[PDB]
Symmetry: T
Subunit: 153 residues, 12 copies
């Protein structure tokens, strides 16, 4: 049932990235406070990057003979990420920490994806997860730096 878990983790990523995109969009829209003018457009950049991973991962899953999740209901039910109603009263520091938590989870997911693909010998999938992990971890450093903190990976 070849590359069963590589396919499974690719599909887990499809759901998680779909929710991550929704969370980033909420931060983008609901953001208020000093720093808005830099961080609001920054969320657009992050979203575009996340969308990039979604399409690389979902393509790779299809290529491997899988069937990507492709309804909001599948994304919601399969994602390990939780969403809450939007709220303008959240601080900038609080909004950025939420993004850090989302990104820490993605970097962990991508590590799992890297591990599982390596074990099954799916080196193409392995590379996709490694590249994505690398960038997310770099963003974790930068976001944490803004927050006067070490990356603490």
């Amino acid at each position: 049932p070849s590359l069963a878990d590589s396919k499974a983790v690719l599909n887990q990523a499809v759901a998680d990235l779909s929710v991550a995109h929704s969370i980033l969009h909420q931060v983008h829209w609901y953001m208020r406070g000093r720093g808005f003018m830099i961080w609001h457009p920054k969320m657009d950049e992050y979203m575009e990057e996340i969308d990039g991973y979604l399409d690389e991962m979902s393509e790779r899953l299809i290529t491997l003979g899988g069937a990507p999740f492709s309804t909001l209901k599948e994304f919601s039910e399969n994602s390990q990420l939780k969403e809450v109603l939007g709220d303008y009263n959240v601080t900038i520091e609080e909004q950025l920490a939420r993004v850090v938590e989302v990104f820490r989870y993605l970097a962990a997911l991508f590590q799992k994806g890297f591990d599982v693909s390596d074990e099954e010998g799916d080196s193409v999938t392995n590379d996709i997860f490694n590249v994505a992990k690398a960038s997310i971890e770099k963003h974790i450093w930068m976001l944490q730096a803004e927050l006067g903190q070490a990356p603490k990976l």
Copy 2:
């Protein structure tokens, strides 16, 4: 302008679901015409997303609170999603896109109507511009399908 705000938020939900449906069509497509229509879904998706950000931004500007979770999109949208299926024909998939766009154009007409009544002329333009392009796509998709636009 509670009604203009209401229809803008309705659009946020529907455009969120429409993007998901376009993505499923993009991914699950099989048959002759794949190489043209697969990347065309990406164009439609980018356009849909552009409407999502215009309408969401305008709602925020009017003092509203956009839907901003998958649960809100799914619960509020009037579009129905189904499981992805590689066995759907390319002609059926394009017909599905047409039905989604017919829905959107009708939603944008409603948004036009509501904002026009409230005198919200900026919101009004947004719906009108979107409607124009969606209707143009309907013509092209229907022409590929050997049909009149039948607006």
Copy 3:
């Protein structure tokens, strides 16, 4: 279309003063956030100048004579200028911009209304487009300032 011509000319004056005020904010700005907001004023200035040229030139096209001297701009504009002062806070400078933009959005509503009354739909569109972008800026500035747009 005397009213539409009149409001276009009012905008020529007010945009001309708006430009000066934006330039004052750009030059006298001090405080954390300078590096983002200083260049931002140049973007706002370029946009305001775009409205100026096109409103002034619509007025010419309609058989009008636009204000074209500093004296005409000062004496016809309803916006008041004050002496540059480096001790104004970043947050108060942004609030000054918001106040200027609230004024412009309100003026552009008036221009929409009068041109709509007179059936000058070309002039109507010019005001509608300008108002849209100015209102979007009020949302962003107010957000930086920890506040709702409150249009």
Copy 4:
């Protein structure tokens, strides 16, 4: 000219003839100003062609059938063509272009009126945008000619 479809198709014919007259001006031009105005006709021609495809597209989208033969253009257009002549002056050629543009601006107003009555807001916008640009060119051309726009 009962409906938007009829006004769009009229525009299809008139824009086709307008293109032809502009091309004649381009080719037969002689006199001081040639080096400016010869390439300017190309810009105008491209602009006229943009209106053509738009208006034709919209007509097809609305379920109509555009005129699509030279006979149909020539017989349905209110514009009148004459034989090319090198002996027409620059200032007379520019005046000929002004008359065509006045005609088109008038036609676009007619399309604006009808689409508004029907509540075809998409078609209404198309005529509005085309009218705005053509009216600006009338100002410039008349200005070259030492004249007010006289819309």
Copy 5:
């Protein structure tokens, strides 16, 4: 008295010199543009999304020949046709009313027939200009013929046929 005014039929249609073939091209390219625009607007059926915009590209290329040829005619001291009446009457291409019910296969075949005609006209122009020693005009016709011939190959290929020039 005053000089008499000759009353005679138009006559001619007589591709005997470079100036004449160029003006014939001016007329035929104008009608060819109209036919291509009809195919573009009225097209329906599978392949629309590729062939619709392809007509726009061909229209652009046709317009390019029109401006090179008509400029060369003016440069040679001629007077290009420049009214829809002169185009329609001088062109050998026949137009019909637009119809949404023509297959892609039939539409592409119509374009092939227009292109074969144009290639043939440009060969005439090449022959006429060469005999004249008008080498600049000769190259305009050669260049246009080459590209139009390449499109015939591709159109024919789409239709599952050899170019059959």
Copy 6:
């Protein structure tokens, strides 16, 4: 004008007024040559605006406070404005621009001299570069007008 800071502020006011004058010329221009000279006015305005922001930043950098209201620009400038008039000829308009430019060039020479004497070599450079290009423009405008530059 006692020092570099003073001459820089003088330039802030005069460049503000020169921009306004160039804009009037741009808007009220009529006559053969409009199509070339109308857009040229925009180029000149953009250049003058460039000098304005280089001179006013240098003044701020030097510990000064730039004029930043229309009242100040108008009161301090040696250039005088008159009401717009469509009846001024193209030749008279270009001659007005030449006179503004001759003034600016002379002001920039004074800026050069004062800064040189104070040993402010950065400010000196700014004035030298501005003077170079304004003088090149005088040659070209004079050449259009059939005359020598007569610096």
Copy 7:
């Protein structure tokens, strides 16, 4: 030392050269509905193939190796077989030929991945992995046009 990595790189030099030739044939002899999309697509595929070739050949050179560099060497050492050009081959048949060539290339690149990993040559390993990824994506899209799963 790195003998077999060098040998698999050189195998790829040969196979990619013949693959380029086959793609050019498909490009030229193509006929049928879809020509206007697929003809130019072959040029994209040829450019990508050529990219792999210069990459792999010059990694081989960098390793102290000597790339095949004549048509006879390409033709004899390649495992791909060429056939005479024939306009009567259908579009569907042509695309299926390209799939088979790409399936071969993807398997070759797996072999190259495996051999270079066995020899500790991680630079060569990555060249093959990157090339493999994009070829497999193409298989998906070609198969999809042909109404099938990728069937990797």
Copy 8:
């Protein structure tokens, strides 16, 4: 290929002198039309330099030795230069350019004939291309001057 080499080298001389004359027109031009025709001379000059370097590297390629000194250019060119004079009218300047161009078009025809006789098809194409463009320019210059091309 003695004759083809000879005429290529003749073109090296004449184009070098033609470049110098164009530059004189560029520099000494005065009168209405300066702003269009002054930079147009730069375009003509670049084109001439292009023919210069096609013809000069074809001669080298053929095993010839191009003139490469001002003495060689001046002595071998059939074009005559006179001292610059600001007093020449714009229309006379353009007349001078047309003369240079008529000469070049005639030389390029000689090039064509000589290379055709000798069977140097590459040199032949170089001349034919240069002749086409120069002759188009004659049409346009003549048209500015209110005249037929009169090739």
Copy 9:
């Protein structure tokens, strides 16, 4: 080589082998000048490939069947390939490229002649344009090697 189709197909084979030989030179190159000449082979390869595709599509267009297998190219080409050798000097490599180019230029002359005889002027120009550029390269390569082009 009977006709135009035959010489076009000869060029398909020969260009294919030439590309292979250029690629060998590119890869096996060692010596002073490598950094300029190695990438230069890529330029030459790109150009040869341009000729190949042009010449093959002209052959198809004429109703021919291009060679399209390595066996056909190798057997039909009159160029001979040898095994790659890193010990060949950079100047010997350049000399090998010249020999290939001299061969191509003569093949192109053969194609010119045959197509002219048949009256196939489109094919005639393809060969002429290719010959022109190859001959220009022969000049430059020979110049690098301190020699006349010897064409």
Copy 10:
């Protein structure tokens, strides 16, 4: 010209150390403002590197021998480096950059002086241009820091 060469060489060392210090600030930066100021350090670094290569190559051109080892940069630079520390506030970091920039502006003033004294006007210009830009940055950095430039 040995004093100009000595100060050029001084600038080589100081700019090398300046680059290093900016890089530390870039890497070790923490606090609100990071996202703007982190990439800004890269812009400054690139600017510093430009002055470096400029001044080094002027030194070479003048027959000097630039410092070209880290030991020489470190030993000759009057700037002092300390171990990187993440616990420095972003305001302290920016003040640190201001102090490096004041040093550099003062160094460039010395080079202007020495080069003027010796009549090396090329070196003089290099120092002046560099000084202008550093002084502009000091204004902006100070404005971020709520302060006058205090040059």
Copy 11:
């Protein structure tokens, strides 16, 4: 991650000295080949700076503290620098870059191995990509020098 951090920081030191050595080569280069190899050094320097910023922000991301002073770079680098000397030949300069690059490639293998052991796959890939390009440069440099890469 103890060793991956250590080897990243070694790279930070080594890349810094490597940039310095390359800059010396760039500056003190003399001999045939200068015009190609002088700018080449700039490309190599840019690439080494890319690895620097990469490796140094991966170290930071991992919770390390990059060397950020010249003293740290010199003291920790395994690469040794010497005074610049114009008498060094091109051959000798290029050989030195080769030795710098061989060292760097070896360090990157070491970094590959350590990160592989520790399972730091992101760091592993940074070293692998950097080693790949360095090794490709070793081939080209060695080819220019007439030798096999001899990795």
Copy 12:
């Protein structure tokens, strides 16, 4: 500003002849290094042409009359031309380029000194900029030739 005008005109002559000499080197070059130095002469030629047009515009702007015939250039230049010779080594060609640039650098110094004396600071800067770039080229050409700049 008589001597300022004088030296500008001298430059016009010297740049015109320098251009001719560079073109001779470009065309007659043979030997190793051709592929880099041949196009390099084009870069140098374009730069020389830039100085020509600016010096000649500045002279016009100052009320002078530039030399504008090959006779004037040749008679007024202090540069000497000889017949082109393919037998010259590339090292001897580059040496001739260095001689011409050394001359220009000295001529530019004389222009700097004379304009500085007459207080024409705009002309002064033109010469200073042109001198800096020529001298940098001398450094590079000399380095290729294994020598110091020796200004």
